From TrEMBL, chain A:
<protein>
    <submittedName>
        <fullName>Uncharacterized protein</fullName>
    </submittedName>
</protein>
Amino acid sequence: TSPADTARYNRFVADLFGMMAYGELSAFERFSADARYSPTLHDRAVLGRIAVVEFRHYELVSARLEAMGIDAEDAMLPFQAAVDYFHSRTRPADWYESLMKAYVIDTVSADFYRAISRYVDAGTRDVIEQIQASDETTEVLRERLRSALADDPRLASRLALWGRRLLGEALTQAQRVSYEHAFLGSLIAAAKELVSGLIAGLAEKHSKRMTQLGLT
Amino acid sequence: SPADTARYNRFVADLFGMMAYGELSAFERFSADARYSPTLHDRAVLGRIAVVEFRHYELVSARLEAMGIDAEDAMLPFQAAVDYFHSRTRPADWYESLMKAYVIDTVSADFYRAISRYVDAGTRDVIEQIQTTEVLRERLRSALADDPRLASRLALWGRRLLGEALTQAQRVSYEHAFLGSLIDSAAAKELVSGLIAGLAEKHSKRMTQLGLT
């Protein structure tokens, strides 16, 4: 390994953090806006809480980028169109779809972090484990979803569709990002295929989770 | 007496209910103004402001919980008024958002300084933790220095904000009055009008300092 090899590896880690930071900022924006539409006053804080956690992650990743001597905004820019597009294609119709979107984005991101944690250094891994969603955090959203599905029979069929839509749109953008501006295959053409194996693993865990909400 | 204590605690509960709901609401509205951010760096600007609001809401709701009051119950009476104020003051651009954040943060800080002396120590401490303004002020001041057209428009926006707030303060005095107690239900109503009038005066001086009519 040469200083050039390491310098390059550090820049791909910067791409990863950049994508993350932008994902987190957007998720904060979306969840916070979505929170206003909650069916009860009791539920208002549900999405506001994950919104704040997301902004906290954004700030931690942003600071890491600066510490690496990298400009946060510059590192984020390349992923802005793809992240914005995904959200524009996953506009929730109501607060239950918002809740579901928060859950799906929370669980898939946590899976991804456990996946890529093996291919990065201990210091990058360290930042990822700080951001990584707790079991109990995710269970709070899951339980609120279960409860909603238990109370309304018309809900399941609509959220099952939505679940499938969220997966499709996130898979479409994952592939656009690996085509249009790749860093993942370099951290993981033949390397792009390893990236697909990771992506499919995420799809598979999402699907087990949908079944456990009694969704197809 | 344990009776007067109970009475006073119900009004401190009303105060925190209002504060918690306003802060929760501020969190949501300040964060929604993200479509206007001029740059990507500016997205973090309203975001941090909004997150501070949510943390205040959590601090105030925790206090209500420590008194054995459901936050929701305490907040409900102020929902209609606070929601109304916000629907009548939706910013149409970046600067109107900043201006609203600035006006709410400055007016509310004056409010806390006005009532602090009248509440117990445990309540004063919550308020004191609830008490970044120059960051907003210098954003606005530097914008108005480089764009004179903004002046007349933000001046109108400033007034609309003041008018819509005052109307709810007045409504909340008849609908669910608690403030006159914390500071004879005739002289109580007067003291609250003097308190409100003083918040308006400080607001108008702040508008002058920003160079607005």
